[PDB]
Amino acid sequence: WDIKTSVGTTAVMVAAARAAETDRPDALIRDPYAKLLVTNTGAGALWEAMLDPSMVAKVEAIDAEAAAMVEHMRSYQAVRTNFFDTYFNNAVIDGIRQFVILASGLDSRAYRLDWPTGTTVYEIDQPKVLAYKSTTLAEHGVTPTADRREVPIDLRQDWPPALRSAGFDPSARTAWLAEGLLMYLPATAQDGLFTEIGGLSAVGSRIAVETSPLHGDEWREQMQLRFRRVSDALGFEQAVDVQELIYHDENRAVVADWLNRHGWRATAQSAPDEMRRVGRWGDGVPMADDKDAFAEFVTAHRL
C-alpha cells in the first residue's frame, strides 16, 4: 500500500466494515467498492477475516465479548453509512447540487450514489489517499457518477483557499459531510472547522456530522484489547491499531448547541437511537448503558 498514517488504518477498518455488510443478502447498505479499496491496501486482510459474516462462529468461540464488538462495529458502520447516505439523498431531492465530503478517506459516495447532472462533489482529504482511491477505481473501470473534484490538502491545514480554487461556489447551497473526523481533531480545531464552514455556506446549506463521544477513548481501549485477542487467536502476523482519541479530555463544544449559537438549526440523533430505529442495536455490547460512549449524528441547515 505505502500509506502508513492513522487516517490510513482507520479508513481501512471502516471500509472493511462496509464491504462485510455489502455482500449480505439483506445488506443495510451496499458499497460495491469497499472490498476493492481494502484488498488493494494489502493491510486489510485481518479486518476482512474478523468482520466476514461467515466467521461469526469462529470469532465467538474465541471471546463472546469481542464477538459483540466485532458485531457492534459491523452494525455501527452500516448504520452510520445508512444515515449519511440518507442525508445525501435528501439534499439531492431538495435541490442541492454542491457537496463537500471532509476527510473523504475511502468513502466512495462520488462513485456509488446516484447524482443528478450538474452535481459537483468536492472531496477533501490527504494527497496520497485521494490519489490511491481514484487510481484504483479508475483502473478497475469505475467512474464517478457525479463531477468529482479532488481537493488534496490536510484537513488541519488551510483548506478553504484550495476548495475555492477547485471551483467551489460559496453562494450555492452546499451539503457538507464530516464522518469519522471530529474525535480526532482537537477541540479548537472543531470550532475552527465549523467557523470556516459557516463562512463558505450559503443560506440553506446543510451539514451532517458524527460527533466525538465524551467517553470515546474508554471504548477505544476495549476495541484494542478485544480485536487484538481475536487476531492473535486468528493467527494474524500483524498487530491491530485502533486510532486513539488523543484529544479526548480536552474541553469540547457540544456540536448542536454550538451550531444553534452560530446561525444553524441543528438536531442530534444519538447513534444508539439510530441503531435502535433500524433494529441494529445490541443491549449486549459493553458500555451499552453509557450513553456517552457513542457518537451522535448531527444535522443542521444554514439559517
Side-chain angles (χ1 to χ4, degrees):
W1 194 15
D2 220 347
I3 286 197
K4 209 186 292 88
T5 66
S6 229
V7 174
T9 306
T10 292
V12 168
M13 189 187 71
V14 303
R18 292 193 302 272
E21 182 69 5
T22 285
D23 279 10
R24 300 172 77 176
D26 293 310
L28 188 77
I29 54 98
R30 309 207 148 75
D31 185 336
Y33 315 114
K35 201 224 296 298
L36 160 64
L37 289 163
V38 164
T39 300
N40 273 253
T41 277
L46 138 73
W47 302 110
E48 298 180 85
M50 215 165 70
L51 284 163
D52 189 348
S54 74
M55 290 281 254
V56 146
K58 287 204 190 169
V59 176
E60 276 251 353
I62 295 144
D63 176 51
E65 314 247 9
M69 246 134 161
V70 171
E71 202 280 335
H72 187 265
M73 196 181 42
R74 193 193 297 117
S75 279
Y76 188 60
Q77 300 302 327
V79 179
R80 180 164 94 186
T81 301
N82 194 228
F83 188 81
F84 291 116
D85 281 1
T86 293
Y87 157 86
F88 267 173
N89 308 309
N90 295 343
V92 156
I93 290 151
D94 299 352
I96 295 182
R97 290 311 178 252
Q98 178 173 81
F99 294 81
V100 179
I101 305 184
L102 299 157
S104 50
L106 306 159
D107 177 319
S108 70
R109 288 170 174 105
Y111 299 84
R112 69 176 160 90
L113 297 187
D114 285 2
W115 299 103
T117 30
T119 313
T120 49
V121 180
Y122 293 93
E123 303 202 7
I124 302 168
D125 211 320
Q126 205 131 212
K128 280 209 202 70
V129 186
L130 294 184
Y132 166 72
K133 177 154 79 192
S134 74
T135 319
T136 300
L137 292 171
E139 264 163 19
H140 291 265
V142 173
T143 14
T145 47
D147 172 51
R148 191 183 84 108
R149 309 196 174 146
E150 277 184 358
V151 189
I153 202 142
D154 189 320
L155 249 148
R156 299 235 238 157
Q157 222 134 31
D158 198 16
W159 58 268
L163 180 47
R164 258 221 211 60
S165 36
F168 186 76
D169 172 4
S171 74
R173 278 153 93 204
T174 306
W176 296 87
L177 182 63
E179 217 187 344
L181 180 51
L182 298 187
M183 336 80 107
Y184 303 134
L185 294 188
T188 59
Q190 174 170 122
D191 302 351
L193 187 73
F194 291 136
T195 280
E196 280 153 355
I197 286 168
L200 297 156
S201 281
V203 179
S205 290
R206 330 251 256 217
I207 184 193
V209 195
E210 186 180 34
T211 57
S212 88
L214 271 190
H215 288 189
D217 205 65
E218 298 206 29
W219 168 269
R220 180 222 56 95
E221 297 178 29
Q222 296 300 321
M223 278 174 85
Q224 276 272 4
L225 116 58
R226 297 311 170 194
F227 284 6
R228 228 222 268 174
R229 195 187 296 278
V230 169
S231 51
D232 253 84
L234 282 170
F236 275 108
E237 18 56 17
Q238 266 277 308
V240 189
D241 92 320
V242 196
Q243 198 174 344
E244 313 191 341
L245 323 212
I246 52 173
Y247 306 116
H248 72 276
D249 55 80
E250 273 172 26
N251 247 102
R252 186 175 303 256
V254 171
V255 161
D257 295 6
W258 194 100
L259 294 165
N260 291 314
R261 284 172 20 248
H262 295 89
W264 306 80
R265 190 116 138 330
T267 320
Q269 160 77 317
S270 75
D273 278 23
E274 181 52 21
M275 291 176 92
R276 267 185 249 118
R277 65 155 265 290
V278 312
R280 279 294 267 280
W281 169 261
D283 249 16
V285 198
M287 290 162 205
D289 40 26
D290 189 1
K291 206 178 58 209
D292 269 303
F294 313 98
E296 325 234 85
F297 304 142
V298 175
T299 260
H301 50 267
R302 180 80 166 164
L303 303 182

